[PDB]
Structure formats: C-alpha cells, structure tokens
Amino acid sequence: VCDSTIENPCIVQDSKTQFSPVIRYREVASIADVYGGNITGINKFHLSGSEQPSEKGWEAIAESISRKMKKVIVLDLRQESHGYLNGRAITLVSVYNWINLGKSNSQSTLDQENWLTGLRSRKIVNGVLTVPQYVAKQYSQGKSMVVSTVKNEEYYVYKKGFDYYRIFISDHRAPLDSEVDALVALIKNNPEDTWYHVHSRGGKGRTTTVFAMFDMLKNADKVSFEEIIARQASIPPFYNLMVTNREIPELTPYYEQRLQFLIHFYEFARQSLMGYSGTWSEWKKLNI
Amino acid sequence: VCDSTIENPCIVQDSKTQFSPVIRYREVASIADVYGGNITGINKFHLSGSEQPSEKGWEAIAESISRKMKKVIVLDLRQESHGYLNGRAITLVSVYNWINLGKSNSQSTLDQENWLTGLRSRKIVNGVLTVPQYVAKQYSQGKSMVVSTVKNEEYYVYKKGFDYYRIFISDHRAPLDSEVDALVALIKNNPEDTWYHVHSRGGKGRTTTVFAMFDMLKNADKVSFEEIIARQASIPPFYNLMVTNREIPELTPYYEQRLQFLIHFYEFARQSLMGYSGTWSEWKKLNI
Numbered sequence: 001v002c003d004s005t006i007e008n009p010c011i012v013q014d015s016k017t018q019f020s021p022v023i024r025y026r027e028v029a030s031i032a033d034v035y036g037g038n039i040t041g042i043n044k045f046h047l048s049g050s051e052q053p054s055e056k057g058w059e060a061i062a063e064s065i066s067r068k069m070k071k072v073i074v075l076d077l078r079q080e081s082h083g084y085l086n087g088r089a090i091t092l093v094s095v096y097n098w099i100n101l102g103k104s105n106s107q108s109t110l111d112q113e114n115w116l117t118g119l120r121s122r123k124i125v126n127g128v129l130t131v132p133q134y135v136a137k138q139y140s141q142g143k144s145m146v147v148s149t150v151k152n153e154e155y156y157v158y159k160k161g162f163d164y165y166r167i168f169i170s171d172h173r174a175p176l177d178s179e180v181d182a183l184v185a186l187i188k189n190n191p192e193d194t195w196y197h198v199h200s201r202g203g204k205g206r207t208t209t210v211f212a213m214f215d216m217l218k219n220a221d222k223v224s225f226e227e228i229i230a231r232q233a234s235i236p237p238f239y240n241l242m243v244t245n246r247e248i249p250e251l252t253p254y255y256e257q258r259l260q261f262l263i264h265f266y267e268f269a270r271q272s273l274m275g276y277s278g279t280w281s282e283w284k285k286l287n288i
Numbered sequence: 289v290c291d292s293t294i295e296n297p298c299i300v301q302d303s304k305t306q307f308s309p310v311i312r313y314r315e316v317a318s319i320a321d322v323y324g325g326n327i328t329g330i331n332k333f334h335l336s337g338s339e340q341p342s343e344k345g346w347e348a349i350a351e352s353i354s355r356k357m358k359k360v361i362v363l364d365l366r367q368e369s370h371g372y373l374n375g376r377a378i379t380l381v382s383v384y385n386w387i388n389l390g391k392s393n394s395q396s397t398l399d400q401e402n403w404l405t406g407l408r409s410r411k412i413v414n415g416v417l418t419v420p421q422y423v424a425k426q427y428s429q430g431k432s433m434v435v436s437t438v439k440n441e442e443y444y445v446y447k448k449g450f451d452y453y454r455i456f457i458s459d460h461r462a463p464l465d466s467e468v469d470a471l472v473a474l475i476k477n478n479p480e481d482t483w484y485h486v487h488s489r490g491g492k493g494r495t496t497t498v499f500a501m502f503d504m505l506k507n508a509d510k511v512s513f514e515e516i517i518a519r520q521a522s523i524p525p526f527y528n529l530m531v532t533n534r535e536i537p538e539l540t541p542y543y544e545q546r547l548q549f550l551i552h553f554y555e556f557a558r559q560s561l562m563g564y565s566g567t568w569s570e571w572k573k574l575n576i
C-alpha cells in the first residue's frame with residue numbers, strides 16, 4: 001500500500017473512466033470574444049489547452065482542432081510520471097505531485113517508462129486510487145484492475161497524427177530555465193501556423209503559465225503585463241496567475257515565484273521583440 | 289549555374305542555418321515504450337539515428353548519447369558527396385541525389401574531397417541553393433556565401449571523440465552486397481556495447497533500413513519479419529519499410545527492391561543466429 005512518499009508513491013486515476021470528457025478545453029483565440037480590454041494579437045493564435053485527457057478525450061480534442069483548421073504539436077507540460085491504464089489517465093503521485101522533482105528530464109522519462117513497463121507486465125494492477133481517495137489518504141482502499149492496456153501519452157497522440165513534445169515543469173511551479181529555453185526554441189523552430197495543444201494534469205496552473213508565455217513572446221511589446229495576465233484569465237477555467245494565495249497555503253511561495261518569473265519573462269519577451277537575440281538563459285544571466 | 293545533371297550538379301544546403309536543430313533524432317530502444325507488439329530484444333540496443341546534422345546538431349546528438357550512457361561510432365550511410373559550409377550541411381546533388389552512383393567507394397570519397405577542397409580554396413562560393421529552390425528548379429537563384437569554413441563530416445565527428453565509418457548506400461536504394469558485408473563486419477568487429485549513431489541525408493529510408501538490419505541480426509530468430517519492420521516504424525518519423533509507393537513514383541522499383549533485400553537479409557540473419565557462419569555475399573550466392 002502506498003503512502004504518498006517518494007519511496008512508496010501512489011497510483012492515482014485521473015480519468016473517472018476511459019470515456020470521461022474534457023472539462024477544461026479552451027482555445028486562446030476565444031479571449032477576443034470575452035475579454036473587455038486590450039485584445040491585440042489574440043485572435044490569430046493556433047493554441048488550445050486542457051487537463052489530462054482520457055482516451056476518449058483525445059478524440060474530442062482532435063475533432064475540436066480539426067474544426068478550427070498544418071502541423072499539430074501536443075505540448076505535455078508534466079514533469080511527473082503519468083500514463084494510461086485501460087484508457088484512464090493515471091499519475092504516480094508523491095506529496096504535492098513531485099515524484100520527479102530535481103531529476104533530469106532523461107531520468108524523469110526513464111522512471112516513467114520503467115513504471116509503465118512494470119504495470120504493463122502485470123495481469124492485475126492493485127492499489128489504483130481515485131483522486132478523492134488519495135486526497136482522503138485512503139491508501140489501502142484502492143481497486144484492483146485487470147490490465148487490458150498500459151500506454152503512455154505518445155500512444156494516443158501518435159494515433160491522431162500529432163507530434164508529442166514534453167516540457168518538464170514541476171506541478172505548482174514555474175518552469176526551470178532549461179524548459180523555458182526549450183519552449184522558446186520549439187516555437188521558433190516550427191512554422192508560425194503550427195497548432196499547439198497545451199496540457200498539464202489539471203489544465204490550470206502550468207497550462208495557463210505557458211499560454212501567457214506564448215502571448216508575451218508575440219505581444220509583450222504592444223500589451224501590458226497586467227493585461228496579458230488578465231486576458232489569459234478571461235476564459236474558462238479563469239485561471240488568474242496574479243493570485244498567489246490559493247487552496248493550499250504551503251504552496252504560496254511557488255505561486256509567488258511563478259508570478260515573479262512571468263514578470264521577468266515578460267521583459268525578456270519585450271526586449272526580444274525589440275532586437276535582443278539571445279536565449280532566456282542568456283538574457284536572465286545579464287538581467288536578473 | 290547548375291542543372292542537376294551529373295555534368296553540372298547543384299550545391300544544396302540541407303541545414304537552414306549552422307544552428308538548426310536535429311528534427312529526426314530517435315533511439316531504437318524507445319520502441320519498447322511505444323510499440324504494442326513483440327518488443328523482444330529491443331530495449332538493450334545502443335542505437336540512435338537522425339538526418340544530416342548541422343554543426344550545432346552534432347552537439348545535441350553528442351549530449352543525447354552521453355545521457356543514455358564505451359565507444360561511439362557515427363555511421364554515415366550516404367554514398368553521395370556531402371560536407372559543410374560555414375557549419376551548414378551541404379550536398380552535391382544530381383537527379384535523385386545519385387551523384388556517386390556506380391562509383392567505387394574510393395572514388396566516391398575522392399570525388400567528395402576534391403569537391404570540398406575546391407570549395408575550401410574559394411573566398412566566395414556561388415550558387416548555394418536551399419532544398420526548396422532545388423526542388424523548384426531555381427538553379428540560378430542560389431546565394432553567394434563568404435567562406436568561413438569548409439569541412440567534411442569527420443571534422444565534427446572527430447571533435448566529439450567519436451569514430452566515423454561510412455557505408456556507401458545510394459539514396460532511395462538498398463545497400464549493395466559490399467556494403468551489407470561491411471556493416472555486418474563492423475558490428476561483429478566491435479564490442480556489443482558499442483553505441484552507433486546512424487544517419488543518412490533525411491534520416492528516413494537508409495537510416496531505417498539499417499535500423500532494421502541491426503534488429504534482424506540480433507532478433508530474427510525470435511521476432512517475425514513483419515514485426516521487425518512494424519516495430520521499426522513505430523517511433524518517429526514512423527518510416528515504414530513495407531511502403532513501396534511513396535512521394536516519387538519513379539522510385540517505386542527501388543523501394544520494392546529494398547524490401548525484397550530485407551526479406552532475404554532477414555533469412556540470412558535468422559540462419560546466422562542458427563549456425564550459419566559465412567558472410568552475406570557468400571550466403572546470397574548459395575540462396576538467391
């Protein structure tokens with residue numbers, strides 16, 4: 001039985017079933033129809049986001065993207081190990097969902113796939129908790145499930161003809177410099193018409209952070225910091241990156257640091273649109 | 289001005305810039321995390337591949353290989369003459385990229401280095417075409433570039449501490465018997481832990497062919513022909529050697545012949561794992 005430590009992490013089932021719908025799907029361009037302030041540079045984005053989809057959720061997302069259309073890149077923002085059991089999204093959860101905190105991206109991927117390979121070799125997976133059970137610390141009341149399939153996200157992304165690219169952001173936290181560099185390079189290294197579907201575990205904090213980063217990279221020289229953050233918060237689920245006191249108070253330092261990073265990324269983006277040609281890591285060394 | 293004939297071949301720049309990233313890097317071992325069928329004998333391969341890297345691409349490849357680790361052998365599969373101008377990968381292109389077709393490997397190397405030496409003696413190289421320009425037959429719209437450096441691949445491979453070994457495969461075609469012999473001997477003559485980075489021009493046809501050959505040599509006695517080909521097609525760029533009708537229909541005969549060779553190489557590999565001790569050329573004489 002798990003105990004949410006890194007030594008005995010929990011299998012937590014994020015999808016209620018393999019048919020569960022996507023509840024936090026949205027397209028950034030819709031901000032132009034809801035936000036009452038500066039909407040300059042919004043309505044042309046090829047950018048959607050969501051929480052972690054179920055098997056069926058990927059179908060709905062693919063259909064949504066096709067209706068709004070080039071290349072489609074699914075942007076997985078999750079550092080933590082995750083995958084699918086019988087079409088249901090699952091996560092390997094330690095306290096604050098930081099199972100892979102402090103690891104190289106190579107080790108994070110290795111640990112995830114070693115875990116998924118282990119589950120895949122079993123006929124029965126025990127100790128599968130729902131999110132309510134995990135929150136309630138009912139570590140021994142998990143269910144035993146006959147294994148039909150165990151898959152990583154790539155399996156479902158590849159099946160839709162999309163690319164998969166992972167940015168290893170720790171839950172509740174700002175991206176590390178390596179991952180900022182990687183995101184900026186990805187955007188620069190792909191056509192401007194590329195569609196990105198950004199997702200995290202909950203489609204809230206990390207997803208909205210990256211939405212804001214996209215917005216700044218394109219518009220920081222014609223839209224104020226406050227309006228970029230505000231307009232990103234204007235569409236459901238209305239995630240406001242200005243808020244640093246949230247449901248879990250022990251996480252406030254990380255929300256404050258994440259907003260502080262966004263302040264600096266905004267200036268980096270603005271100066272980049274004005275002539276600066278280096279990377280985020282190079283700019284940060286000279287300016288912070 | 290060039291005209292894509294062997295008498296006036298074109299200088300074609302494969303790298304957009306000297307900083308262009310590697311877009312088709314993958315490791316064969318990853319098949320074990322994506323392929324839903326027989327994965328026996330995959331997860332221990334020390335095998336990566338890519339398209340022709342830019343100067344900077346070699347750095348990324350070296351870093352990738354170090355993260356997954358003995359000797360490292362860069363396996364250049366390209367018969368055609370190629371090199372680098374100011375850090376950008378370049379190719380001497382005749383129709384269907386067959387500038388060195390029918391030549392001995394010694395002559396191919398000689399012709400390449402005579403060409404590179406000629407470019408290196410110039411302060412300005414004229415007629416440098418991008419791939420789009422070449423495809424569009426805009427032979428006179430090439431750019432003139434001040435020569436900072438002209439290098440062969442060895443220069444960058446040696447700088448990373450890797451070995452360089454060339455297998456002279458014609459673009460779009462199966463390897464000739466001499467080159468099959470050479471590949472099999474190379475694998476046999478080096479430790480089983482040796483890391484191989486296999487690349488062609490596009491990191492598609494020739495690279496995937498050799499991936500399959502590696503797989504067969506180790507696993508043909510426990511994995512079916514169809515599953516070796518299928519599992520090699522399971523990871524990006526999803527090159528499926530079963531497909532013989534591709535973008536260019538005049539090349540279908542060569543794709544069919546390449547698949548036919550793989551059928552025979554599979555049997556050779558299987559019998560070799562079962563006791564046969566001769567070379568491919570010896571086996572082919574007795575069995576085809």
Ligand SMILES: O=P(O)(O)O[C@H]1[C@H](OP(=O)(O)O)[C@@H](OP(=O)(O)O)[C@H](OP(=O)(O)O)[C@@H](OP(=O)(O)O)[C@H]1OP(=O)(O)O
Pocket residue numbers: 051096097131171172173200201202203204205206207246247248
């Ligand atoms: O998946 P959910 O059940 O909807 O939970 C989300 C998820 O975090 P957890 O799943 O670990 O609880 C969000 O993170 P992302 O995967 O989208 O990055 C997190 O975002 P932040 O901590 O950055 O805010 C958010 O937190 P919050 O509620 O404060 O918005 C939290 O939501 P819930 O606590 O309501 O489940």
Ligand SMILES: O=P(O)(O)O[C@H]1[C@H](OP(=O)(O)O)[C@@H](OP(=O)(O)O)[C@H](OP(=O)(O)O)[C@@H](OP(=O)(O)O)[C@H]1OP(=O)(O)O
Pocket residue numbers: 339384385419459460461488489490491492493494495534535536
């Ligand atoms: O380098 P690319 O622009 O990506 O082109 C590649 C490259 O051929 P060319 O560069 O000469 O066009 C592949 O060859 P390799 O160097 O990897 O051996 C070739 O492989 P095949 O002809 O064997 O299939 C492939 O062809 P295809 O598209 O049919 O996969 C083709 O791709 P593109 O035509 O899309 O450029």
